[PDB]
Amino acid sequence: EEFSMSFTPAVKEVVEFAKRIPGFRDLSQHDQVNLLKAGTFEVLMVRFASLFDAKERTVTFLSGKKYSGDLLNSMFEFSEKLNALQLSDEEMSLFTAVVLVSADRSGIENVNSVEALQETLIRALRTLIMKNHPNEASIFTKLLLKLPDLRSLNNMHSEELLAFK
């Protein structure tokens, strides 16, 4: 409850976010549906982190209200680690687009076009991180390391979410 349904309109939000990713609407319709089908779960993981605060033990839901079981524990270790980097909203958005365009390539027909879009987003992320965190370049590396982590959480818990919310 009070979090079940909270992730239904969130799916609608990912679709709209993707549409705003420069170049996304150039990929085949086939590839756009597949990136969203495969990556929506990983983007939602990042969005959750963004609505968490281990610095105050508060978890805010896209729904509004604020509060403080083994996926939920993973979502906390994940969120704490990511929240540690102290990214700005702009970095957070760019990173989320990288996550979406980094999704499982199994159902993708034009991988070259998807890798080309990921490259463009990756280069901007690194460029944007170096500028806002000149002495913390490593922040960029830590973010890439999270891609394999999110793919595992996905492989393991997507079903217990991508089902009736």
Swiss-Prot record:
It is found in: Nucleus; Cytoplasm. Residues 1-165 form the NR LBD domain. Heme binds at H157. Residues 1-165 are annotated as: Interaction with ZNHIT1. Deacetylated by HDAC1. Acetylation and deacetylation regulate its transcriptional regulatory activity. Transcriptional repressor which coordinates circadian rhythm and metabolic pathways in a heme-dependent manner. Integral component of the complex transcription machinery that governs circadian rhythmicity and forms a critical negative limb of the circadian clock by directly repressing the expression of core clock components BMAL1 and CLOCK. Also regulates genes involved in metabolic functions, including lipid metabolism and the inflammatory response. Acts as a receptor for heme which stimulates its interaction with the NCOR1/HDAC3 corepressor complex, enhancing transcriptional repression. This is Nuclear receptor subfamily 1 group D member 2. It comes from Homo sapiens (Human). The lineage of its organism: Eukaryota, Metazoa, Chordata, Craniata, Vertebrata.
